[PDB]
Amino acid sequence: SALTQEASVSGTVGQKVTLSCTGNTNNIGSYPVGWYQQISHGPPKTVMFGNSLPSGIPDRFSGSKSGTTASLTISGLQPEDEADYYCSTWDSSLSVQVIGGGTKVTVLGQPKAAPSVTLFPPSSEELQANKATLVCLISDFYPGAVTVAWKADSSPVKAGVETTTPSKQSNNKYAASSYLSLTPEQWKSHRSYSCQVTHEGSTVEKTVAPT
Amino acid sequence: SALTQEASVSGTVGQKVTLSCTGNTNNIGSYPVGWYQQISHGPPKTVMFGNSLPSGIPDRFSGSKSGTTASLTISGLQPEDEADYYCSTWDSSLSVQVIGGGTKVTVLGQPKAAPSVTLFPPSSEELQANKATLVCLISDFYPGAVTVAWKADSSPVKAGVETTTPSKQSNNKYAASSYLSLTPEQWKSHRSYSCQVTHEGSTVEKTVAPT
Ligand SMILES: [Br-]
């Protein structure tokens, strides 16, 4: 996505909370930014546009912009704000409206939990079949929204990544998976591979290497 | 909602489907309508603005509008067209972007595919940390509904099992993962552990062993 939003932004009731939306000079750096809110699967509604507060929305919501990063601040987080928030703007470089991935804003009803990250190399059984897959297990995190990035050696992998939608497990925390399909030629040629998981203020990165 | 959309619409592969967006004179009747596609609660993409086709969106998407009702027509439904579609415009009585409730498009008759199962033994990084985790990667299956059962040697295992709800990946197929938490001594005390995946009455099972 041309616009980058954080995965999860949470806090207790009455807490000052801030979302961000990062792009480039051809979208956020020169065009107004709108923020839309969607609860469950209900109808989305505009809650901020061009740093201007729409009629009917409370003034706890405030929008600002500095360079290529727009922000939505919620001064006094309340339970009725628990929703997904999407930012969007016009992208003159592509001549189309452009929308970010969305941020899940959660009112904490349970302790915030950073995720456990376990990186699995390709088993010898799979490589004996001329196949290679790496799995990055993301477990026991709340709220259920994370950002995953992969690195070949120390350079990012810009293709081949598949990350599952977080799902709630039996302990009421969330779990997800991110797998990367390779060939035996790449797994041996590279010195290491990395999976990086971002959950609010916590970022965990695991690294594995061929035997 | 100020904009009215049908809740859900279905159609087989190759059918022509038309979604409608109903509004007012101060919003739909006066201003261009944009259509936005959201998948797997992923980043949404605009598929039609002002009845004109953006770049990269195939020709099968066409837009029309007459009076206070705008329409998006999708000829030749494909698996990747299956999504939620939202329409939005500018309202003039109010001064806001307004969004409809969305239309869930379900593409029928998509090809079936058995899941590819990959069972990962506990990594060396976590065995040295006195941990043990088996991960059963399930991918490339349609439809998106599996049932996972584990085995220690030949005995069923339930305690320590968590399975992710399937989610659609970039190939329009589903992916999930089930993980079993063990201690390092359970892991070597047994001959093997197994992960059985059942999809559409047919079973795929994998088996791993220590070191
Ligand atoms: Br702005």
Author numbering:
A (entry chain B), B (entry chain A): 2 to 212
Sentences from the paper on this structure:
LCs were distributed in two groups: a set of eight amyloidogenic LCs responsible for severe cardiac involvement and symptoms in patients (hereafter, H LC), and a set of five non amyloidogenic LCs isolated from patients affected by multiple myeloma for which no amyloid aggregation or proteotoxicity was observed in patients (hereafter, M LC). Five H LCs (H3, H6, H7, H9 and H10) and two M LCs (M7 and M8) were successfully crystallized and their 3D-structures solved. The crystal structures were all refined to satisfactory refinement parameters; in all cases the LCs were dimeric, with an overall quaternary arrangement closely matching that of the previously reported LC dimers. VL and CL domains display very different structural properties in the seven crystal structures. CL domains (res 115–214) are typically characterized by high quality electron density, are all very well superposable, and the dimeric CL–CL arrangement is clearly conserved in all the analysed structures (root mean square deviations -r.m.s.d.- generally fall below 1.0 Å over the entire CL–CL dimer - Table S3A and Fig. 4B-bottom).
(ii) All the selected LCs were of the λ isotype, which is overrepresented among amyloidogenic LCs (approximately 75%), all the H LCs (except H10 from germline 1–36) belong to germlines commonly found among AL patients. At the protein concentration required for Near-UV experiments four LCs (H10, M2, M8, M10) precipitated before the unfolding process was complete, thus Tmapp could not be determined. Analysis of the data shows that the kinetics of proteolysis correlate well with amyloid propensity: H3, H6, H7, H9, and H16 are almost or totally proteolysed after 60 minutes, and more than 50% of H10, H15 and H18 LCs is cleaved after three hours. Contrary to the limited information offered by the spectroscopic analyses, controlled proteolysis provided a robust indication that M LCs are more rigid, or less dynamic, than H LCs. These are however divided into two subsets: H3, H6 H7, H9 and H16 are very efficiently proteolysed, while H10, H15 and H18 show slower cleavage kinetics. In H6 and M8 dimers all six CDRs (three for each LC monomer) are traceable in the electron density; in H9 and H10 five out of six are traceable, in H7 three, and in H3 and M7 only two CRDs are traceable. In some cases (H6, H9, H10) CDR3 (residues 89–97) participates in the interface; both CDR3s in the H7 dimer lack electron density, while in M7 and M8 CDR3 residues are located far from the VL–VL interface. In the structures of all H LCs and in M7, the association interface is roughly symmetric, and is located on the five-stranded beta sheet (strands 1, 3, 4, 7, 8), where the 3, 4, 7, 8 strands establish the intermolecular contacts.
